[PDB]
Design a protein around this nucleic acid. Structure first.
Ligand SMILES: Nc1ncnc2c1ncn2[C@@H]1O[C@H](COP(=O)(O)OP(=O)(O)O)[C@@H](O)[C@H]1O
Ligand code: ALF
Ligand SMILES: [Mg+2]
Length: 414
DNA sequence: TTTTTCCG
């Protein structure tokens, strides 16, 4: 029931005939990730798939960029020395790879792409960008941008003219075609589609937004909550958890580990039937950051979860390090997940959603929230949708103007 | 504000 469009066929043929890098873009729900999976299945190339968030990576069938390439947290400058500590298994996988596929490219920082370039040139012992691997990037720059803190932007501004993937320094040595998928599949209502598109490109009017008046406090566990803020996610999850038959698991912290740096729950509260997400990758055991499941049993030292993909996993406690090394913390690598942030929702489709957007603070955040849903009637909102929720990023206007006027190509022409 | 590592 997947439709192969002529645009998709042309892009397939482009990637097979032309070794250039490619950005496949298009609006929310235009079939980008669906086509990604088609491209790989049909290409004869060895492909590896990655994405910046764990949820998006799982949705595309791959792994996070940070896991695949062993990337540390925090900004990486071109002068920082990288630990090249790949196992032989990982080196071999990266050497066999012919095509690197990255989904949700909009959330990829430019220093992440440059780190990937540097690590691949080290693995391949080559001066070719990305070690000579062909890179195909999928996404929508008008959805969420990469997560950066103010201090990180300050550090990065010495080397980067902006904070989107196309600002990476590697694009002074290589470049990419931009191709687009222009048919929307996720939604089917033309007026809903028109308002989504005009929110996306900042052109929406007051009159167009009137279509969304029925969202706020709409009268109706089928509705999925997606929120701008983690504090809201935590409240909704605690509500849905309840107080019946709860088990609590306390973190053990050992020495230095600021509380604002702890990656896990301080007091993990669970029950049988609880919707949860894995926080860590363990490919040997078949689980990965962002994988979703349902708790089926709780014990002293083991939490049993039936994953959405049908696997039952027995989670034991995991130990994080804060480094060199000074302190550590130990806790089950699980967190409740009925509710999720909008950043985590990017890439997913839902029939029924409740969005908490009374405070938006990222370009593309409102657009991602609304565009998750297949129909207008399936959205409930905590707030009236207004133009103040839209935050323009004019560097994206400049970028599209540049490539559209220069032959749908960006970066160094080869 | 929001996110993210290293196959035993
Ligand atoms: N080629 C296609 N034919 C039919 N339906 C599609 C196609 N591509 C996507 N869809 C529908 O749209 C939904 C979202 O598509 P997806 O690939 O996730 O969009 P994108 O990654 O562009 O946001 C899918 O769940 C499916 O219902
Ligand atoms: F562009 Al998408 F889900 F990947 F809307
Ligand atoms: Mg997608």
């Amino acid at each position: 029931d997947m439709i192969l469009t002529e645009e998709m066929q042309k892009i397939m043929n482009l990637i097979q005939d032309d070794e250039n890098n490619v950005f496949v873009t298009g609006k929310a729900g235009s079939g980008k990730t669906t086509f990604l999976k088609y491209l790989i299945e049909k290409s004869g190339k060895n492909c590896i798939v990655a994405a910046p968030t764990g949820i998006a990576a799982i949705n595309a069938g791959g792994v996070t960029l940070h896991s695949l390439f062993g990337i540390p947290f925090g900004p990486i400058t071109p002068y920082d020395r990288l630990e090249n500590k790949f196992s032989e298994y990982k080196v071999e996988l990266l050497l066999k790879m012919e095509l690197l596929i990255i989904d949700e490219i909009s959330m990829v920082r430019p220093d992440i792409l440059d780190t990937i370039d540097r690590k691949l040139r080290w693995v391949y012992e080559s001066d070719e960008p990305f070690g000579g691997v062909q890179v195909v990037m999928f996404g929508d720059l008008f959805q969420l941008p990469p997560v950066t803190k103010k201090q990180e932007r300050e550090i990065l501004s010495d080397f980067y003219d902006g904070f989107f993937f196309f600002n990476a320094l590697v694009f002074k040595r290589t470049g990419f075609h931009i191709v687009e998928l222009t048919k929307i599949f996720r939604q089917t209502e033309p007026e809903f589609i028109n308002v989504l598109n005009n929110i996306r490109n900042y052109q929406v009017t007051s009159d167009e937004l009137d279509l969304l008046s029925e969202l706020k406090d709409r009268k109706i566990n089928e509705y999925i909550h997606i929120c701008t803020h983690k504090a809201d996610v935590e409240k909704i999850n605690a509500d849905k958890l309840g107080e019946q038959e709860i088990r609590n698991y306390d973190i053990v912290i050992k020495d230095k580990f600021p509380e604002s740096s702890i990656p896990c729950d301080l007091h993990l509260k669970l029950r049988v039937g609880a919707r949860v997400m894995s926080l860590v990758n363990d490919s040997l055991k078949g689980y990965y950051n962002g994988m979703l499941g349902i708790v089926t049993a709780l014990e002293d030292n083991v939490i049993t979860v039936r994953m959405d993909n049908g696997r039952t996993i027995k989670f034991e406690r995991y130990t994080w390090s804060n480094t060199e090394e000074i302190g550590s913390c130990t806790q089950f690598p699980l967190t409740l997940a009925w509710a999720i942030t909008i950043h985590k929702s990017q890439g997913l489709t839902f029939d029924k959603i409740i969005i908490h957007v009374s405070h938006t603070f990222c370009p593309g955040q409102l657009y991602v929230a609304l565009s998750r849903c297949r129909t207008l009637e399936g959205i409930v909102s905590d707030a009236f949708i207004t133009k103040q929720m839209i935050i323009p990023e004019y560097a994206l206007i400049d970028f599209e103007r540049a490539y559209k006027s220069e032959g749908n190509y960006y970066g160094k022409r080869l």
